[PDB]
Short mmCIF file of N, CA and C in Angstrom, two decimals:
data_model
loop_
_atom_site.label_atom_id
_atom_site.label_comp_id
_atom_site.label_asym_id
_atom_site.label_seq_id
_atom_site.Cartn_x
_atom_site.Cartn_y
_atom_site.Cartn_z
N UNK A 111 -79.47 -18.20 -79.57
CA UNK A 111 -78.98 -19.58 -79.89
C UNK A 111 -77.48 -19.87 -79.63
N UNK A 112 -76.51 -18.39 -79.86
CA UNK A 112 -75.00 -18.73 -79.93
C UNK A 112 -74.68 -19.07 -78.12
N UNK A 113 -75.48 -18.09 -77.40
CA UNK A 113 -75.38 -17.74 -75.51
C UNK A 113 -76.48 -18.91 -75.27
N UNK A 114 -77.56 -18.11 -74.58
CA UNK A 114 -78.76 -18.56 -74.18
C UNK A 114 -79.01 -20.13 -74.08
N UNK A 115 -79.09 -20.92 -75.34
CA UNK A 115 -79.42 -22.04 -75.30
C UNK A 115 -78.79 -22.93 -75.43
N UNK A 116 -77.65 -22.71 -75.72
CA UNK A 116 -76.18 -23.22 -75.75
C UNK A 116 -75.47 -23.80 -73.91
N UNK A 117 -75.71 -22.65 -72.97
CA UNK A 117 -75.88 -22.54 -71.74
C UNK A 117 -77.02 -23.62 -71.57
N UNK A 118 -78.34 -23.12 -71.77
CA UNK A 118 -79.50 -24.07 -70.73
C UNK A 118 -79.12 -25.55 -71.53
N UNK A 119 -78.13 -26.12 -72.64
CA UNK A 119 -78.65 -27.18 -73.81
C UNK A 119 -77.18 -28.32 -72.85
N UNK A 120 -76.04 -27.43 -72.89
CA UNK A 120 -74.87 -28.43 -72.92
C UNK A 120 -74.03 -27.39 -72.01
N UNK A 121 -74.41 -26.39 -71.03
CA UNK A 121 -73.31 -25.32 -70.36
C UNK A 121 -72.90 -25.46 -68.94
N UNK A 122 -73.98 -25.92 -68.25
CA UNK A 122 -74.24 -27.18 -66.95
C UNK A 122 -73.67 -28.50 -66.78
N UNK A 123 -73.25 -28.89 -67.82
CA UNK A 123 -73.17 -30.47 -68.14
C UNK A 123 -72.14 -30.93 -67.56
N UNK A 124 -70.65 -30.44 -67.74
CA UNK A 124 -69.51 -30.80 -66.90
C UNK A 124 -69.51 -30.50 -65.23
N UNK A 125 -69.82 -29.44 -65.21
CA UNK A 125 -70.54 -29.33 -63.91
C UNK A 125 -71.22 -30.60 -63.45
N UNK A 126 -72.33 -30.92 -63.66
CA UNK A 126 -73.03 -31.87 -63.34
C UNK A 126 -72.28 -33.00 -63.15
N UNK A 127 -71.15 -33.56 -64.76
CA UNK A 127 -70.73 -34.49 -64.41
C UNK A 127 -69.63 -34.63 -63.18
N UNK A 128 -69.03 -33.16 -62.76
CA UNK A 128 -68.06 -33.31 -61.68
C UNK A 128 -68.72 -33.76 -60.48
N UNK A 129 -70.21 -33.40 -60.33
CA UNK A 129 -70.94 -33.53 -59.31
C UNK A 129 -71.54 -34.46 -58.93
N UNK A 130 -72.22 -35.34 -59.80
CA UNK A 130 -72.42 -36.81 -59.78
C UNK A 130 -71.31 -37.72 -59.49
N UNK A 131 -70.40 -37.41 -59.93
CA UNK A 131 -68.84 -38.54 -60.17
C UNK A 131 -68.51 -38.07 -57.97
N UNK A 132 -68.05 -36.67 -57.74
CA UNK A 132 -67.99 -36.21 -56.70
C UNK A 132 -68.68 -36.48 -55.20
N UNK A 133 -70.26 -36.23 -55.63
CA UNK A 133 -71.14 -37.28 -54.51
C UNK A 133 -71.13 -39.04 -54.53
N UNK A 134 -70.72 -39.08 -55.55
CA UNK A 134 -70.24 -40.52 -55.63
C UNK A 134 -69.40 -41.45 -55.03
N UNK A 135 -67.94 -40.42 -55.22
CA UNK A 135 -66.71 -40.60 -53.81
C UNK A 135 -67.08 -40.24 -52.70
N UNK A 136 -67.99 -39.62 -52.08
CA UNK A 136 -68.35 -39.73 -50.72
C UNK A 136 -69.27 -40.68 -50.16
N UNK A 137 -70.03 -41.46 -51.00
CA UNK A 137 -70.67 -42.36 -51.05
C UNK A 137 -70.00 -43.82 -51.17
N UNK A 138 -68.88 -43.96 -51.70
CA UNK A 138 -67.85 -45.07 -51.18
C UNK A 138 -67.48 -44.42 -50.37
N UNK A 139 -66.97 -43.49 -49.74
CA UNK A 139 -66.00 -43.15 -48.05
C UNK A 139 -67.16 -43.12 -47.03
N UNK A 140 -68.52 -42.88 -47.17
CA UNK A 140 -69.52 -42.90 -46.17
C UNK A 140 -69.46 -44.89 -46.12
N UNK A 141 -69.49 -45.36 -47.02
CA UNK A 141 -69.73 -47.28 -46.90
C UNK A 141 -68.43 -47.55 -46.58
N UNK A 142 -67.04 -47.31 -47.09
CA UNK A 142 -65.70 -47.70 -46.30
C UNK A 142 -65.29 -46.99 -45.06
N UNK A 143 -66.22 -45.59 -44.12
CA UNK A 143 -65.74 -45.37 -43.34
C UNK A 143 -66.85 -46.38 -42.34
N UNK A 144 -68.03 -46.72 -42.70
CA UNK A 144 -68.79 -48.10 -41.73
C UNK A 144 -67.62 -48.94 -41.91
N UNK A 145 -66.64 -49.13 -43.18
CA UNK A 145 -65.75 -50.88 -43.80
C UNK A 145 -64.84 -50.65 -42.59
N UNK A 146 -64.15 -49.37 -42.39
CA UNK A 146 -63.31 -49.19 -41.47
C UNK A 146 -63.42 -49.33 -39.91
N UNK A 147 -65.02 -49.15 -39.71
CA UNK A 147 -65.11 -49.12 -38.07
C UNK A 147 -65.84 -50.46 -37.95
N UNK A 148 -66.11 -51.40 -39.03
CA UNK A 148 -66.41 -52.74 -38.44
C UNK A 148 -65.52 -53.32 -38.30
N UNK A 149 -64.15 -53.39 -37.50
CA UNK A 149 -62.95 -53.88 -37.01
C UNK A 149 -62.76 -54.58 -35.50
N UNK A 150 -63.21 -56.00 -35.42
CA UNK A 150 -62.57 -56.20 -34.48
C UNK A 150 -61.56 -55.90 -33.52
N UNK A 151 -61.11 -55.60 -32.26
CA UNK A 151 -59.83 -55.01 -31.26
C UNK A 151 -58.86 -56.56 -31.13
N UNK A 152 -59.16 -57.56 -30.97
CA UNK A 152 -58.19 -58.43 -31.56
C UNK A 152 -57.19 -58.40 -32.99
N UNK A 153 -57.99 -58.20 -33.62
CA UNK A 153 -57.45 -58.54 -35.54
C UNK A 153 -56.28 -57.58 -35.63
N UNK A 154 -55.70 -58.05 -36.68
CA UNK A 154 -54.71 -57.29 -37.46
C UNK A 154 -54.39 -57.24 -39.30
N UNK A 155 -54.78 -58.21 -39.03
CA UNK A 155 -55.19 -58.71 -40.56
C UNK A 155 -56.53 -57.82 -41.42
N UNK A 156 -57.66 -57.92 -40.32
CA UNK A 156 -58.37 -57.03 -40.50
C UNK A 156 -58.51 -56.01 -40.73
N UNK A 157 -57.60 -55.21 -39.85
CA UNK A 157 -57.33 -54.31 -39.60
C UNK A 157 -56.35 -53.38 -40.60
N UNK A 158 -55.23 -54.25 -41.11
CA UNK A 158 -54.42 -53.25 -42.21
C UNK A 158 -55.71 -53.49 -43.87
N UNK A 159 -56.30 -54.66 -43.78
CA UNK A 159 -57.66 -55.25 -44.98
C UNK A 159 -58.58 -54.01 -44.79
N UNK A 160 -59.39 -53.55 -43.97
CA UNK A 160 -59.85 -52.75 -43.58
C UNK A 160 -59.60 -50.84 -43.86
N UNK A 161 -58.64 -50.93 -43.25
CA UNK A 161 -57.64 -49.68 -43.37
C UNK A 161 -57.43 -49.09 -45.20
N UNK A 162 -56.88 -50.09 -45.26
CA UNK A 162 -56.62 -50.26 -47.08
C UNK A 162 -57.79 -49.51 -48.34
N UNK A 163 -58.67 -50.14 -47.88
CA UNK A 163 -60.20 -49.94 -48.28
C UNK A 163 -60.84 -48.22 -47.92
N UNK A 164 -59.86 -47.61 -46.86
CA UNK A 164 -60.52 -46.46 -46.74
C UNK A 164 -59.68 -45.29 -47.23
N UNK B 111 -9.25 -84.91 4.48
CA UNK B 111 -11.11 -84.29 4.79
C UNK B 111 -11.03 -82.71 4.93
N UNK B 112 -10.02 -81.84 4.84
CA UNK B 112 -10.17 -80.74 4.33
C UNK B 112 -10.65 -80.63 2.38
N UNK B 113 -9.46 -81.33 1.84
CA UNK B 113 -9.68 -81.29 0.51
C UNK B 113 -10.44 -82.27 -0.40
N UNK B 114 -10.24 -83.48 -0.01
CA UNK B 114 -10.75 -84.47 -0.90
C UNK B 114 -12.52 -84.81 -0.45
N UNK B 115 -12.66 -84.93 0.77
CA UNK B 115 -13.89 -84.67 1.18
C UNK B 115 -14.97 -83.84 1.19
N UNK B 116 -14.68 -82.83 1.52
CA UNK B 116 -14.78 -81.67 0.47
C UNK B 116 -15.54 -81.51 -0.54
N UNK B 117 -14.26 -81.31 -1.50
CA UNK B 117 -14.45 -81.76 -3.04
C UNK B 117 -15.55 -82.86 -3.20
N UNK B 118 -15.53 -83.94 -2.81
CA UNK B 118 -17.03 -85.00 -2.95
C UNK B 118 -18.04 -84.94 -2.77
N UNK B 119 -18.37 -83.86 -1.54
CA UNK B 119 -19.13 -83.95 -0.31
C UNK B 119 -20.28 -82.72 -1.21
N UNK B 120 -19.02 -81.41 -1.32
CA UNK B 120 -20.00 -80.17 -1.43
C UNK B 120 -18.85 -79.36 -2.36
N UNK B 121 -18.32 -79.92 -3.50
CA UNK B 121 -17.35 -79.06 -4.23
C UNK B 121 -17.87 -79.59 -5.59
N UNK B 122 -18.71 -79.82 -6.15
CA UNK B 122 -19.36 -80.13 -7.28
C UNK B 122 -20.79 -79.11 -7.09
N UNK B 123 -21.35 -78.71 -6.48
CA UNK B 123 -22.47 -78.37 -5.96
C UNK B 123 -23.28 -77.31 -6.39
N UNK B 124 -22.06 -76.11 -6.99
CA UNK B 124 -22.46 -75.25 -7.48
C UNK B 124 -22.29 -75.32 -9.20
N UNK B 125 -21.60 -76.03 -9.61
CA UNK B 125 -21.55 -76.66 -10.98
C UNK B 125 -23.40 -77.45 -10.96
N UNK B 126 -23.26 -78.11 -10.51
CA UNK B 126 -24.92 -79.13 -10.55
C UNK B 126 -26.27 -78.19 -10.39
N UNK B 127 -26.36 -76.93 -9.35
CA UNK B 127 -26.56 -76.29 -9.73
C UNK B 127 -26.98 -75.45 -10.84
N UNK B 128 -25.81 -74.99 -11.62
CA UNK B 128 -25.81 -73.85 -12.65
C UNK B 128 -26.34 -74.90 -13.73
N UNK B 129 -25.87 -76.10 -13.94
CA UNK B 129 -26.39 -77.09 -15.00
C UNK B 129 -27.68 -77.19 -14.97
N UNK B 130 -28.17 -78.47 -14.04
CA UNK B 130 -29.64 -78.35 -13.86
C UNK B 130 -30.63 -76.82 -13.75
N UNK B 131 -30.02 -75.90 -13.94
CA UNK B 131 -30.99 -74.81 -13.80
C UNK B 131 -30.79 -73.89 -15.30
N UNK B 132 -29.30 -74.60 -16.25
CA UNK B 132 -29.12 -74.01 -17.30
C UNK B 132 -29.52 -74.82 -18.06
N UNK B 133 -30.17 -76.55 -18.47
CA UNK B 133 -30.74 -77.47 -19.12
C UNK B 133 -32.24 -76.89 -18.73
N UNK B 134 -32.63 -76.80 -17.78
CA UNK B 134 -34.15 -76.07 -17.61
C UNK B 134 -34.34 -74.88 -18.26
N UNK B 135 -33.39 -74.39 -18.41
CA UNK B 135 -34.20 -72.91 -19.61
C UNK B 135 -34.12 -72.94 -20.90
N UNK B 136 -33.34 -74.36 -21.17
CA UNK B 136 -33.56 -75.14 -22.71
C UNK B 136 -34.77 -76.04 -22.49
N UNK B 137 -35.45 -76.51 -21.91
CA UNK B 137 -36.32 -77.09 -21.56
C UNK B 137 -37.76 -76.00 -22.15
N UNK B 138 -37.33 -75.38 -21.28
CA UNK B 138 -38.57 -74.20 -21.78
C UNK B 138 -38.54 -73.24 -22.85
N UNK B 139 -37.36 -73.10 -23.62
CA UNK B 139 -36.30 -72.42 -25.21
C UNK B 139 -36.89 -73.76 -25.90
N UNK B 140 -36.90 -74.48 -26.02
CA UNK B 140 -37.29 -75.93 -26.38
C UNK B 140 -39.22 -75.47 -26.89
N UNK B 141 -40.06 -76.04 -25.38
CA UNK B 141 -41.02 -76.04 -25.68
C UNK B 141 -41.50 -74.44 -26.40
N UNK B 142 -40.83 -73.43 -25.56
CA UNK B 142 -41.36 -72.07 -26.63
C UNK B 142 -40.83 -71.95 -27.81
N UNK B 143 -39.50 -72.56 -28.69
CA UNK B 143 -39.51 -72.68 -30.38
C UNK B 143 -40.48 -73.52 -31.22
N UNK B 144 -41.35 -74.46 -29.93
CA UNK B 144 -42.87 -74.91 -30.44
C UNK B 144 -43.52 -73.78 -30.46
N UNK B 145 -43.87 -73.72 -29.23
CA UNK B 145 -44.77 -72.72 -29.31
C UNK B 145 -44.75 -71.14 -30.10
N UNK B 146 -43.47 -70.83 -30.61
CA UNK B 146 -43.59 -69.81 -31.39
C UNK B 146 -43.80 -70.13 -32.70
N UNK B 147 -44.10 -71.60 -32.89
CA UNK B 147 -43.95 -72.29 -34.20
C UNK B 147 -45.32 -72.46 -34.96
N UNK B 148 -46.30 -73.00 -33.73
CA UNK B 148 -48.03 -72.42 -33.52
C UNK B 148 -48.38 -71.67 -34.06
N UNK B 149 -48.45 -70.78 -34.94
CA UNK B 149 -48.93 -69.45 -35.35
C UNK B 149 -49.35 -69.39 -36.58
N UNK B 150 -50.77 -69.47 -36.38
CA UNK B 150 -51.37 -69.46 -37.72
C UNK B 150 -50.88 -68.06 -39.07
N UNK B 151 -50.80 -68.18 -40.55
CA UNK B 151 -50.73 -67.23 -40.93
C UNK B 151 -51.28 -66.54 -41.25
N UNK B 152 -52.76 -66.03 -40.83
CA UNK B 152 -53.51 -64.92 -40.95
C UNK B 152 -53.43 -63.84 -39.40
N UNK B 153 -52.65 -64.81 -38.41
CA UNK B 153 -52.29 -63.80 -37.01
C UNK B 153 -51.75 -63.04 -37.08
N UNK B 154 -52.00 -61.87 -36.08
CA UNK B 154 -50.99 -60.78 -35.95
C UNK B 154 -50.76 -60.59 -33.99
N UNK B 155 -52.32 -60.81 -33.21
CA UNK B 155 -51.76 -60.96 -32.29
C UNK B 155 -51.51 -62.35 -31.98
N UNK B 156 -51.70 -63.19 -32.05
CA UNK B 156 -51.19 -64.57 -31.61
C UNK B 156 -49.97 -64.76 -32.01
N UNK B 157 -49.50 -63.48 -32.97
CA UNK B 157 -47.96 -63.89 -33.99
C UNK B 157 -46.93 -62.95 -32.52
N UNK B 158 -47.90 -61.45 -31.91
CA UNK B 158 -46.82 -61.23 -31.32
C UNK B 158 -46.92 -61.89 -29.86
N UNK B 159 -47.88 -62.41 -29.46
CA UNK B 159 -47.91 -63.23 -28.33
C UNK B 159 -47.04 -64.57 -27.79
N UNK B 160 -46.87 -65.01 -29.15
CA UNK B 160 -46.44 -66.18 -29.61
C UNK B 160 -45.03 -65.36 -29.07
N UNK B 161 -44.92 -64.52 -30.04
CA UNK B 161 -43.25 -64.23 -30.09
C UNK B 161 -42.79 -63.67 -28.60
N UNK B 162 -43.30 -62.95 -27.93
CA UNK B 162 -43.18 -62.40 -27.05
C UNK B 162 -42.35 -63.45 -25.57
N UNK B 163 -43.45 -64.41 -25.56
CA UNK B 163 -42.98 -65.58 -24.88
C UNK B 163 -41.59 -66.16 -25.53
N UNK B 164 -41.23 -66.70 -26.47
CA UNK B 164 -39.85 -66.87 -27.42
C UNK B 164 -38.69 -65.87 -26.52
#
């Protein structure tokens, strides 16, 4: 009860939460690195708006 | 008719000249402080296009 289940109950848990929170930020940089390459070659405005975001 | 003739004939000439050809590049200093004036504010290339001509 003090090891064992203590581990399988609550010993994983920060772990987990680094890992959820973690795949999470790559999951906004996978959608702002599409934000970044939908950039017009005219713009500039866009372009630093764009940039910003990634 | 060495000097005074001359002078009437073809001794102003290069003055009229340098004028009429130095009022023509205010002419066009003129219309391009319009035209650099054009520039919407969300541009960046029309801002340096704009300016470039200026």
């Amino acid at each position: 009860q003090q090891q064992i289940q203590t581990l399988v109950k609550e010993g994983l848990r920060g772990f987990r939460e680094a890992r959820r929170d973690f795949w999470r930020g790559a999951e906004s940089l996978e959608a702002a690195l599409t934000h970044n390459a939908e950039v017009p070659r005219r713009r500039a405005q866009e372009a630093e708006e764009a940039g910003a975001a990634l």
